Design a protein around this motif. Sequence first.
Motif, PDB file in Angstrom:
ATOM      1  N   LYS A  58       0.820  -1.180   0.104  1.00 17.62           N
ATOM      2  CA  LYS A  58      -0.017   0.018  -0.068  1.00 17.62           C
ATOM      3  C   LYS A  58       0.931   1.200  -0.010  1.00 17.62           C
ATOM      4  N   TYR A  59       0.531   2.183  -0.995  1.00 21.31           N
ATOM      5  CA  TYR A  59       1.212   3.493  -0.895  1.00 21.31           C
ATOM      6  C   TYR A  59       1.032   4.308   0.523  1.00 21.31           C
ATOM      7  N   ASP A  60       2.085   4.674   0.895  1.00 22.62           N
ATOM      8  CA  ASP A  60       2.136   5.462   2.151  1.00 22.62           C
ATOM      9  C   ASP A  60       2.546   6.817   2.215  1.00 22.62           C
ATOM     10  N   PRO A  61       1.760   7.746   2.271  1.00 15.39           N
ATOM     11  CA  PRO A  61       1.966   9.034   2.155  1.00 15.39           C
ATOM     12  C   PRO A  61       2.680   9.730   3.367  1.00 15.39           C
ATOM     13  N   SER A  62       2.803   8.822   4.455  1.00 18.12           N
ATOM     14  CA  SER A  62       3.617   9.222   5.759  1.00 18.12           C
ATOM     15  C   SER A  62       4.975   9.210   5.305  1.00 18.12           C
ATOM     16  N   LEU A  63       5.566   8.602   4.090  1.00 19.80           N
ATOM     17  CA  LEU A  63       7.100   8.298   3.732  1.00 19.80           C
ATOM     18  C   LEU A  63       7.503   9.580   3.050  1.00 19.80           C
TER      19      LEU A  63
END
Length: 257
Positions: free
Chosen positions: A37-42
């Motif tokens: 899953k794409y992680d925007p917190s990265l």
Amino acid sequence: HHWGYGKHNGPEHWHKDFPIAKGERQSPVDIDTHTAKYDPSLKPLSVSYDQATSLRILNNGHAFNVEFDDSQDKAVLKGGPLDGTYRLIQFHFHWGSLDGQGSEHTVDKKKYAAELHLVHWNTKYGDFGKAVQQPDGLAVLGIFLKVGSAKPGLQKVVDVLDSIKTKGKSADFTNFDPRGLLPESLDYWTYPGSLTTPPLLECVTWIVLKEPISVSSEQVLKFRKLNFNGEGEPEELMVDNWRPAQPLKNRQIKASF
Ligand SMILES: Cc1onc(-c2ccccc2)c1-c1ccc(S(N)(=O)=O)cc1
Ligand SMILES: [Zn+2]
């Protein structure tokens, strides 16, 4: 009777001397791209290898390591899932006896011809020895290798392999620029894992790039000419020095894209 990649001392035997081999965060793992899953917190990944200073190349009987002087903050990996600065200490590869196998991580069960591991330790721990006693002590940047066009930046490594054919041999290897081994894109998958060879310590934040680099058949063929054995011993070609995918357990693979 030391560990290796043979039938009597291979990956399926490691757990006896290293019980963590059946641990909760072992590497490598299969990367199911649809489940990741794409992680925007990265945060943006930062690979700063401009001041990287290599020193030596060594055949350790399992693979070969290109070592760097990490006494100062020079070649560093930051950003992405990382908290702080990780310093490059060495890089090595895992490869197969055939082009259809060799990588440790797999993508939707697909195996690449080889896999490059750029090893970094978290500077907040002072030295790599202390770092491998911490759950976030290491960060390994993994890059897949497929066979096709040659990778110019890899040739210098290939040409010195004749000097370190057997276990225990080392050779001066200065001014090698690891930037020449990086693909165009830094898109990646990340998950908490471990060292893929004994001691199999679970202190690694894995960052595996999606884009593989291409190397020529001739370049990888030279990798396969190396020896697991030491000088003066029966020849055992250094091939298939990869550990297979391990149980994902209670982990989620995150994508940077
Ligand atoms: C064997 C061994 O002994 N020491 C290390 C080591 C060296 C520097 C930093 C962290 C671990 C390793 C080591 C073991 C596995 C890996 S890997 N294949 O990148 O997970 C990388 C390094
Ligand atoms: Zn490795």
